[PDB]
Amino acid sequence: STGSATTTPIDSLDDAYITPVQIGTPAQTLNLDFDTGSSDLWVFSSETTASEVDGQTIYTPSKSTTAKLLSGATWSISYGDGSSSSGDVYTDTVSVGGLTVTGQAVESAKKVSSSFTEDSTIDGLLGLAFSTLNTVSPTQQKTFFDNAKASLDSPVFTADLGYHAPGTYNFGFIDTTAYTGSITYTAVSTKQGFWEWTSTGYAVGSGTFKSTSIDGIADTGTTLLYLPATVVSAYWAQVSGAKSSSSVGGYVFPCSATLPSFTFGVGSARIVIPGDYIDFGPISTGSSSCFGGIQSSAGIGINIFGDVALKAAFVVFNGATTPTLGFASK
Question: Are 327 and 267 contacting, i.e. CB atoms less than 8 angstroms apart?
Answer without folding.
Answer: no
